[PDB]
Amino acid sequence: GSSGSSGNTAPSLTVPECAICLQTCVHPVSLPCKHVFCYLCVKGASWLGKRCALCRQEIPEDFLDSGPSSG
Ligand SMILES: [Zn+2]
Ligand SMILES: [Zn+2]
């Protein structure tokens, strides 16, 4: 069925910047706090632990870990 939908609806076709490493966001992830960061910088950065860097909005484990191992 329908499984796997990410923020596609975009006014342009480019990659935004990051507010954690200060460089092109390799993986722009729309956080529940209305922000964008590298899927890696959010999953676990050097100075980050399951929490935004701009607003520090607690991120739910489900955010990254969604759905059972096997579908
Ligand atoms: Zn980053
Ligand atoms: Zn935030």
Distance CA 37, CA 24 (A): 9
Tell me, in angstroms, the distance from the centre of ligand 1 to residue 22's CA: 7
Domain that holds residue 27: 1-71
Tell me, in angstroms, the distance from the centre of ligand 2 to residue 20's CA: 11
Backbone angles phi, psi at 44, to 5 degrees: 160, 95
Backbone angles phi, psi at 62, to 5 degrees: -65, -25
Question: Strand runs (DSSP E) across 1-71, as ranges?
Answer: 28-31, 35-38
List % helix, strand, coil for the chain (3-state, nearest 5). 15, 15, 70
Tell me, in angstroms, the distance from the centre of ligand 2 to residue 37's CA: 9
Distance CA 25, CA 19 (A): 9
Q: End-to-end alpha-carbon separation of the chain, Å?
A: 10
Return all residues near 30 (Cβ < 8 A) that are at least 6 apart: 7, 36
The experimental technique used to determine this model is: NMR
Q: Which of 68, 64, 42 is nearest to 53 (CA)?
A: 42
**Could you give the number of structural domains in the chain?**
1
4 Ramachandran zone, left/alpha/beta (phi>0; psi -120 to 50): left
